[model samples]
Target: MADQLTEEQIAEFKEAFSLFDKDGDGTITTKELGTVMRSLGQNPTEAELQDMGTIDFPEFLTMMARKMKDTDSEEEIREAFRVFDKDGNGYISAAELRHVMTNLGEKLTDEEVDEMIREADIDGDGQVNYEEFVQMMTNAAAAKIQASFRGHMARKKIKS
Candidate 1:
């Protein structure tokens, strides 16, 4: 969330960018999206899509970053952190995270836990504090909407 995106997020961005940018160039014409919509026979807008102009990989990520965003109430955000902040220690240490991975949900590999902490511990102090967890969850909230909106549009565009 800080200067870091989760490993999966970074990996997906790479694949999705390449998938959508079919011309093999390092840039995506806004028409890439419009053309796919065309493939699906969606004729929503031409000049509107043109407004986006040309976009590169970094610019692509920016849109997703814009897509990636959060609205959990502060108390709810704080409350959710309490699970990882088990000792009421005001921060989530890797030790606590490792145990909770199994305790509260499905079992995850040691490396999975490692990756989670690696990205989330924004201050690099080896622990995820309140603000760090908040950002992680906040960013996640935006991601879900992005996923849903993308899916919804894809479905709609296909129908038309």
Candidate 2:
């Protein structure tokens, strides 16, 4: 859609995927994803831990893949971004984000907004641009699949 990935984007993708592939075995598995979460300081609950099985991995992947494939011809992804990109500058600014959150009945102090901006703005360039926001969504999706896949694999290994 946006031509092929730029050299920088390819480099970024490789780096991100390397981190994503926790086991360093090329393909991503659930345990590796859990390790990444732990490194990020999240001590996931037992339920969360259980979700990382391999069976869950396939289930979630199937669901996400189906959704993406089914909705690709529709306005699904584009529609989603419109809800977040309030000012319509092809990006979501801090102020726009604050306004949207307020509309959603989650009022926040300026300090709270600033804090959120800091956390969500992964690049730390003082904004959560569209690319960063989409990356965040993708990371979350991948983490969920990773956790589910791990749990699924663990149980299968146990049964055999």
Candidate 3:
């Protein structure tokens, strides 16, 4: 079982997942994953889009295996989110989100931010609220396991 996540990490994970879980169906779809590049203002090649579609988010980490501060710690994730929650409104607005990303050295144009708000805002409410945001992140991290672990284990012949 996954360990309890820190509050900050929960928030960080929420920000990322809410941006990607386009349908708000509590899981991601191919179209959702493909939109990441699109959100960045680039039309990724069909092949590139296809590549992301076939893999889940954890798998996406394999494509960018790199040396960096360890993000495996849930505490870090929580801290990142806390920092990103600029207004401390328990949620993030487009401007606040862009500001947070900039602090992480990822610059976002106003156009890009607008697109993100358009795509990630599941409620059409113009802002990403905390509860929806957190639920998306939690789902992204473990929904596949929750949905298919038994089937996976059966295939692998694993024991309880």
Candidate 4:
């Protein structure tokens, strides 16, 4: 869907789509969509499943592009966690958490580290797990979305 993709990238997408069109019918069935999405751990909703009855090349390309975008965000989030997960134990301890701020040449006091852990460390643990990390980041994103929505409503009100 993004026009900025290289010509080679676009060609790869077309080739992949063709491969999925097993019957050479130029369309992929809903069952195939379900199987592929499930394999990627992105389970489609009932409405999405119903809509994927027989997706054409363009439709399949759009779906794959959306999946790629989602994958990019997922990878970015994992990378962010990895930055603070110094020990590779899948959890960010207070010392590991401080490493991020301190590594940037900022001296974070113990109180500051404790506060962050208290805010993000779910399950009463002193370390932040991946689930808790995602939840914390998601809450911040939700707040940003709410702010954007409010701004849009205010603009509409001013126009009215």
Candidate 5:
């Protein structure tokens, strides 16, 4: 399953491994991991690290793979839509969408903002509803998986 992670995501693991693997030993000790986590705002106890044996690259990869798998759960997925949901109004406004889109990701343009809001505005109401948000998020997640797994496949597929 570790092999399912993308190249870019793998690069991220290397960066963490580099930071966690002090002394450049390429082996992550419990003390090393715990100390690193503590420094990064995590309050890890020895009890947590007691059974975490030294991790080589292979184990580290699986650890990361495992860690992120849980990130796809409900609250985490809900958190993302709420970010764009702006003022917590039941539906997302165009101004709210513009503000978030213009400031992040690909740094959206005016057209992009309209297009994005419309893509999820399934009711043709020029605003985003919760149903549309869930649909868009689902589609985006599937696209990410497809892109990573089928790197050399056609960027977009033909209709079945």
Candidate 6:
């Protein structure tokens, strides 16, 4: 689980971390995080700042994954969908799927791509649309409300 990020995702995470690492010090400190949080209209308590600590690459990746898993916004989902919607036609075709999987370092057979679309398309449209993409991402979260509540509780701990 700790090594779950795909190649593309790791690249993006590295890029994002560099952007956030204001001093180019290879780590993000509480001060940097507080600056970012304030820019986004969030208040970071001293405890929150301490909790963030000096984030290195592994911690940075975990934080990124947590943020992604915690959100259920339509716009966020759409933005993620746009990554694989190669032509910006508002749908992901099998070729796009192949490209994205390859970018992620996963070589999927044509049959696997077909099966993925079969499972993910959901509307018999032979392609993946934004709504379907959102559903695919959120279905696991929806199914385990208990687990989500625990995550929420864990988040609350940061506040307290």
Top candidate, metric lDDT: 4
Clashing pairs in 4: none
**TM-scores of the models, in the order given:** 0.35, 0.32, 0.30, 0.49, 0.36, 0.35
1-160 per-residue lDDT for model 1 (tens digits): 3234567766667676677777658777776755533443345454334335667777656544443342235445566556446588788766765665644534555764565565555644656675655544433433332333334345545887
What stretches of model 2 exceed 4 Å from their correct place?
1-78, 84-87, 105-115, 122-127, 139-160
Total backbone collisions for each predicted model: 0, 15, 4, 0, 0, 0
Could you give candidate 3's per-residue lDDT for residues 20-83 as a string of tens digits? Answer: 7665444566656556545544364654534533445544443322211222433334444555
Worst 10 residues of 3 by lDDT: 62-71
User: Which candidate number maximizes TM-score?
Assistant: 4
lDDT value, residue 82 of candidate 5: 67
Tell me the lDDT of model 2 at 59. 42
Model 3: residues with Cα > 4 Å off, grouped in runs: 1-75, 102-104, 122-126, 134-160
Of candidates 4 and 2, the better by TM-score: 4
Compose the digit string of candidate 2's lDDT tens values, residues 72-141: 5234444555656647766766566565544443343455445445545564344456545443332232
TM-score comparison, 1 vs 3, better candidate: 1
Model 4 ranges with Cα > 4 A deviation = 2-4, 20-25, 34-52, 93-124, 131-160
List lDDT for all candidates, in order.
Answer: 0.54, 0.46, 0.45, 0.58, 0.56, 0.55
Model 5 lDDT tens row, 1-160: 8777999878866776778777548787766766644554446454344425577877767755665564464345455556556578767665665665566554546763454555454654656575455434433533332233233223224333
List, residue by residue over 1-160, the lDDT tens digit for candidate 6: 4466678877766775677877648887756665644544446466343444577768767765654454535455466556556688788765655555544433444554454455455654556565665544443322232232234345646786
* Model 5 ranges with Cα > 4 A deviation: 2-77, 84-86, 122-126, 139-160
Estimate the Cα RMSD of every predicted model relative to the unseen true structure.
16.6, 15.4, 19.6, 8.7, 12.5, 13.6
Location of the lowest summed lDDT over 10 successive residues in candidate 4: 138-147
TM-score of 5: 0.36
